[PDB]
Coordinates of all heavy atoms in Angstrom, one line a residue:
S1 N 70.9 -46.8 5.0 CA 71.7 -45.7 5.4 C 71.6 -44.4 4.5 O 72.2 -43.4 4.9 CB 73.2 -46.2 5.5 OG 73.6 -46.7 4.3
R2 N 71.0 -44.6 3.4 CA 70.7 -43.4 2.5 C 69.5 -42.6 2.8 O 69.3 -41.6 2.2 CB 70.6 -44.0 1.0 CG 71.9 -44.7 0.5 CD 71.7 -45.0 -0.9 NE 72.9 -45.7 -1.5 CZ 72.9 -46.3 -2.6 NH1 71.8 -46.4 -3.5 NH2 73.9 -47.1 -3.0
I3 N 68.6 -43.1 3.7 CA 67.3 -42.5 3.9 C 67.2 -42.1 5.4 O 67.3 -42.9 6.3 CB 66.1 -43.4 3.5 CG1 66.1 -43.6 2.0 CG2 64.8 -42.7 3.9 CD1 65.2 -44.7 1.5
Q4 N 66.8 -40.8 5.7 CA 66.3 -40.3 6.9 C 64.8 -40.3 6.9 O 64.2 -39.5 6.2 CB 66.9 -38.9 7.2 CG 66.5 -38.4 8.5 CD 67.2 -37.1 8.9 OE1 67.9 -36.4 8.1 NE2 67.0 -36.6 10.1
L5 N 64.2 -41.2 7.6 CA 62.7 -41.4 7.7 C 62.2 -40.3 8.7 O 62.6 -40.2 9.8 CB 62.4 -42.8 8.1 CG 60.9 -43.2 8.1 CD1 60.3 -43.1 6.7 CD2 60.8 -44.6 8.7
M6 N 61.1 -39.6 8.3 CA 60.4 -38.7 9.1 C 58.9 -39.1 9.1 O 58.2 -39.1 8.0 CB 60.5 -37.2 8.6 CG 61.9 -36.7 9.1 SD 62.2 -34.9 9.0 CE 60.8 -34.2 9.9
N7 N 58.3 -39.4 10.3 CA 57.0 -39.7 10.5 C 56.2 -38.3 10.7 O 56.5 -37.6 11.6 CB 56.8 -40.5 11.8 CG 55.4 -41.1 11.9 OD1 54.6 -40.9 11.1 ND2 55.1 -41.7 13.0
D8 N 55.2 -38.1 9.9 CA 54.2 -37.0 10.0 C 52.8 -37.4 10.1 O 51.8 -36.7 9.8 CB 54.4 -36.0 8.8 CG 54.0 -34.6 9.0 OD1 54.0 -34.1 10.2 OD2 53.7 -33.9 8.0
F9 N 52.6 -38.7 10.6 CA 51.2 -39.2 10.9 C 50.8 -38.4 12.2 O 51.5 -38.4 13.2 CB 51.2 -40.7 11.2 CG 51.1 -41.5 9.9 CD1 52.2 -41.7 9.1 CD2 49.8 -42.0 9.6 CE1 52.0 -42.5 7.9 CE2 49.7 -42.7 8.4 CZ 50.8 -43.0 7.5
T10 N 49.5 -37.9 12.2 CA 48.9 -37.3 13.3 C 48.0 -38.2 14.2 O 47.8 -38.0 15.4 CB 48.1 -36.1 12.9 OG1 46.9 -36.4 12.1 CG2 48.9 -35.0 12.1
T11 N 47.6 -39.3 13.5 CA 46.8 -40.3 14.1 C 47.5 -41.7 14.3 O 48.5 -42.0 13.7 CB 45.5 -40.5 13.3 OG1 45.9 -40.9 12.0 CG2 44.7 -39.2 13.2
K12 N 47.0 -42.6 15.2 CA 47.5 -43.9 15.3 C 47.0 -44.8 14.1 O 45.9 -44.6 13.6 CB 47.0 -44.5 16.6 CG 47.7 -43.8 17.8 CD 47.2 -44.4 19.1 CE 47.7 -43.7 20.3 NZ 47.0 -44.1 21.5
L13 N 47.8 -45.7 13.7 CA 47.4 -46.7 12.7 C 46.7 -47.9 13.4 O 47.3 -48.5 14.2 CB 48.6 -47.1 11.8 CG 49.1 -46.0 10.9 CD1 50.3 -46.5 10.1 CD2 48.0 -45.6 9.9
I14 N 45.5 -48.3 12.9 CA 44.7 -49.4 13.4 C 44.5 -50.4 12.3 O 44.4 -50.0 11.1 CB 43.4 -49.0 14.1 CG1 42.5 -48.1 13.1 CG2 43.7 -48.2 15.3 CD1 41.1 -47.9 13.7
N15 N 44.5 -51.7 12.6 CA 44.2 -52.7 11.6 C 42.7 -53.0 11.6 O 42.2 -53.5 12.7 CB 45.0 -54.0 11.9 CG 44.8 -55.0 10.8 OD1 44.1 -56.0 11.0 ND2 45.3 -54.9 9.7
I16 N 42.0 -52.7 10.5 CA 40.6 -53.0 10.4 C 40.4 -54.0 9.3 O 41.0 -53.9 8.2 CB 39.9 -51.7 10.0 CG1 40.2 -50.5 11.0 CG2 38.3 -52.0 10.0 CD1 39.6 -49.1 10.5
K17 N 39.6 -55.0 9.6 CA 39.3 -56.1 8.6 C 37.9 -56.0 8.0 O 37.7 -56.3 6.8 CB 39.4 -57.5 9.3 CG 40.8 -57.9 9.5 CD 40.8 -59.3 10.2 CE 42.2 -59.9 10.2 NZ 42.2 -61.0 11.1
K18 N 36.9 -55.5 8.8 CA 35.5 -55.4 8.4 C 34.9 -54.1 8.7 O 35.1 -53.5 9.8 CB 34.7 -56.5 9.1 CG 35.0 -58.0 8.7 CD 34.1 -58.9 9.5 CE 34.2 -60.4 9.1 NZ 33.1 -61.1 9.7
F19 N 34.2 -53.5 7.7 CA 33.5 -52.3 7.8 C 32.0 -52.5 7.6 O 31.6 -53.3 6.8 CB 34.0 -51.3 6.7 CG 35.4 -51.0 6.8 CD1 36.4 -51.7 6.1 CD2 35.9 -50.0 7.6 CE1 37.7 -51.5 6.1 CE2 37.3 -49.7 7.7 CZ 38.2 -50.4 7.0
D20 N 31.1 -51.8 8.4 CA 29.7 -51.7 8.1 C 29.6 -50.6 7.0 O 29.9 -49.5 7.2 CB 28.9 -51.4 9.3 CG 27.4 -51.6 9.1 OD1 26.9 -51.5 7.9 OD2 26.7 -52.1 10.0
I21 N 29.1 -51.0 5.8 CA 28.8 -50.1 4.7 C 27.3 -50.0 4.4 O 27.0 -49.7 3.2 CB 29.7 -50.6 3.4 CG1 29.4 -52.0 3.1 CG2 31.2 -50.3 3.7 CD1 29.7 -52.3 1.6
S22 N 26.5 -50.3 5.3 CA 25.0 -50.3 5.2 C 24.5 -48.9 5.0 O 25.1 -47.9 5.4 CB 24.3 -50.8 6.4 OG 24.8 -52.2 6.7
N23 N 23.4 -48.7 4.3 CA 22.6 -47.5 4.1 C 23.5 -46.4 3.5 O 24.1 -46.6 2.4 CB 22.0 -47.1 5.5 CG 21.1 -48.2 6.0 OD1 20.4 -49.0 5.3 ND2 21.0 -48.4 7.3
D24 N 23.5 -45.2 4.1 CA 24.2 -44.0 3.6 C 25.8 -44.3 3.5 O 26.5 -43.4 2.9 CB 23.9 -42.8 4.5 CG 22.5 -42.4 4.5 OD1 21.8 -42.5 3.4 OD2 21.9 -42.1 5.6
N25 N 26.3 -45.3 4.0 CA 27.8 -45.6 4.0 C 28.3 -46.3 2.7 O 29.5 -46.5 2.6 CB 28.1 -46.4 5.3 CG 27.7 -45.7 6.6 OD1 28.1 -44.6 6.8 ND2 26.9 -46.3 7.4
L26 N 27.4 -46.5 1.8 CA 27.8 -47.1 0.5 C 28.8 -46.2 -0.4 O 29.6 -46.7 -1.1 CB 26.6 -47.4 -0.3 CG 25.8 -48.6 0.1 CD1 24.4 -48.7 -0.6 CD2 26.5 -49.9 -0.3
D27 N 28.7 -44.9 -0.1 CA 29.7 -44.0 -0.7 C 31.1 -44.2 -0.3 O 32.1 -44.0 -1.0 CB 29.3 -42.5 -0.4 CG 28.3 -41.9 -1.4 OD1 28.2 -42.3 -2.5 OD2 27.7 -40.8 -1.0
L28 N 31.3 -44.8 1.0 CA 32.7 -45.0 1.5 C 33.4 -46.2 0.8 O 34.6 -46.2 0.9 CB 32.5 -45.4 3.0 CG 31.8 -44.3 3.9 CD1 31.7 -44.8 5.3 CD2 32.6 -43.0 3.9
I29 N 32.7 -47.0 0.1 CA 33.3 -48.2 -0.6 C 34.5 -47.7 -1.5 O 35.6 -48.2 -1.4 CB 32.3 -48.9 -1.5 CG1 31.2 -49.6 -0.6 CG2 33.0 -50.0 -2.3 CD1 30.0 -50.1 -1.4
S30 N 34.3 -46.6 -2.3 CA 35.4 -46.1 -3.2 C 36.5 -45.5 -2.4 O 37.7 -45.7 -2.8 CB 34.8 -45.1 -4.1 OG 33.9 -45.7 -5.0
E31 N 36.3 -44.8 -1.3 CA 37.3 -44.2 -0.4 C 38.2 -45.3 0.3 O 39.4 -45.3 0.2 CB 36.7 -43.3 0.6 CG 35.9 -42.1 -0.2 CD 35.4 -41.0 0.8 OE1 35.6 -41.1 2.0 OE2 34.9 -40.0 0.2
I32 N 37.5 -46.3 0.9 CA 38.1 -47.4 1.5 C 39.0 -48.2 0.5 O 40.2 -48.5 0.8 CB 37.1 -48.4 2.2 CG1 36.4 -47.7 3.3 CG2 37.8 -49.6 2.7 CD1 35.1 -48.3 3.8
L33 N 38.5 -48.5 -0.7 CA 39.3 -49.2 -1.7 C 40.5 -48.4 -2.2 O 41.5 -49.0 -2.4 CB 38.4 -49.5 -2.8 CG 37.4 -50.6 -2.6 CD1 36.4 -50.6 -3.7 CD2 38.0 -52.0 -2.4
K34 N 40.3 -47.1 -2.4 CA 41.5 -46.2 -2.8 C 42.6 -46.3 -1.7 O 43.7 -46.5 -2.1 CB 41.0 -44.8 -3.0 CG 40.3 -44.6 -4.4 CD 39.8 -43.2 -4.5 CE 39.0 -43.1 -5.9 NZ 38.4 -41.8 -6.0
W35 N 42.2 -46.1 -0.5 CA 43.2 -46.3 0.6 C 43.8 -47.6 0.6 O 45.1 -47.7 0.7 CB 42.5 -46.1 2.0 CG 43.4 -46.2 3.1 CD1 43.7 -47.4 3.8 CD2 44.3 -45.2 3.6 NE1 44.7 -47.1 4.7 CE2 45.2 -45.8 4.6 CE3 44.5 -43.9 3.4 CZ2 46.2 -45.2 5.3 CZ3 45.5 -43.2 4.0 CH2 46.4 -43.8 5.0
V36 N 43.1 -48.7 0.5 CA 43.6 -50.1 0.5 C 44.6 -50.3 -0.7 O 45.7 -50.8 -0.5 CB 42.5 -51.1 0.4 CG1 43.0 -52.5 0.1 CG2 41.6 -51.2 1.7
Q37 N 44.3 -49.7 -1.9 CA 45.1 -49.8 -3.0 C 46.4 -48.9 -2.9 O 47.5 -49.4 -3.1 CB 44.3 -49.4 -4.3 CG 45.0 -49.7 -5.6 CD 44.2 -49.3 -6.8 OE1 43.3 -48.5 -6.8 NE2 44.5 -49.8 -8.0
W38 N 46.2 -47.7 -2.4 CA 47.4 -46.8 -2.1 C 48.3 -47.4 -1.0 O 49.5 -47.4 -1.2 CB 46.8 -45.5 -1.7 CG 47.9 -44.5 -1.3 CD1 48.6 -43.7 -2.2 CD2 48.4 -44.1 0.0 NE1 49.5 -42.9 -1.6 CE2 49.4 -43.1 -0.2 CE3 48.2 -44.5 1.3 CZ2 50.1 -42.5 0.8 CZ3 48.8 -43.8 2.4 CH2 49.8 -42.9 2.1
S39 N 47.7 -47.9 0.0 CA 48.5 -48.6 1.1 C 49.3 -49.8 0.5 O 50.5 -49.9 0.9 CB 47.5 -49.0 2.2 OG 48.3 -49.6 3.3
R40 N 48.7 -50.6 -0.3 CA 49.4 -51.8 -1.0 C 50.5 -51.3 -1.9 O 51.6 -51.9 -1.9 CB 48.4 -52.6 -1.7 CG 47.6 -53.5 -0.7 CD 46.7 -54.4 -1.5 NE 45.9 -55.2 -0.5 CZ 45.1 -56.2 -0.7 NH1 44.8 -56.7 -1.9 NH2 44.5 -56.8 0.3
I41 N 50.2 -50.4 -2.8 CA 51.2 -49.9 -3.9 C 52.3 -49.0 -3.3 O 53.4 -49.2 -3.7 CB 50.4 -49.2 -5.0 CG1 49.5 -50.3 -5.7 CG2 51.3 -48.6 -6.1 CD1 48.6 -49.8 -6.8
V42 N 51.9 -48.1 -2.5 CA 52.8 -47.1 -2.0 C 53.4 -47.5 -0.6 O 54.5 -47.9 -0.5 CB 52.2 -45.7 -2.0 CG1 53.3 -44.6 -1.7 CG2 51.6 -45.3 -3.3
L43 N 52.6 -47.4 0.4 CA 53.0 -47.6 1.8 C 53.8 -48.9 2.0 O 55.0 -48.9 2.4 CB 51.8 -47.5 2.8 CG 51.3 -46.0 3.1 CD1 50.1 -46.2 4.0 CD2 52.3 -45.1 3.8
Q44 N 53.2 -50.0 1.7 CA 53.8 -51.3 1.9 C 55.1 -51.5 1.2 O 56.1 -52.1 1.7 CB 52.8 -52.5 1.6 CG 51.7 -52.7 2.5 CD 50.8 -53.8 2.2 OE1 50.9 -54.4 1.1 NE2 49.9 -54.2 3.0

């Protein structure tokens, strides 16, 4: 009762388990992991 929640998401949230990180996508490993860590520590 102390919090008024405001949603400012522009996109839908999807549950993703597996990513293709082949070839040029190896740079995405650090971005995906930062999101996973931020989502666990902050969002959840």
Side-chain angles (χ1 to χ4, degrees):
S1 56
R2 300 184 180 166
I3 297 168
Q4 182 174 8
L5 183 67
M6 285 194 52
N7 190 6
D8 202 32
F9 278 79
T10 65
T11 60
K12 293 176 184 168
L13 288 180
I14 59 170
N15 183 259
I16 308 168
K17 282 181 174 168
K18 293 183 174 190
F19 302 94
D20 197 331
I21 57 156
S22 304
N23 304 325
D24 298 318
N25 301 304
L26 284 168
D27 272 338
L28 302 178
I29 296 171
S30 291
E31 298 187 358
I32 293 165
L33 288 168
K34 280 175 183 177
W35 179 270
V36 171
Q37 193 181 17
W38 180 82
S39 186
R40 285 180 180 191
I41 294 178
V42 188
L43 282 180
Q44 286 183 352

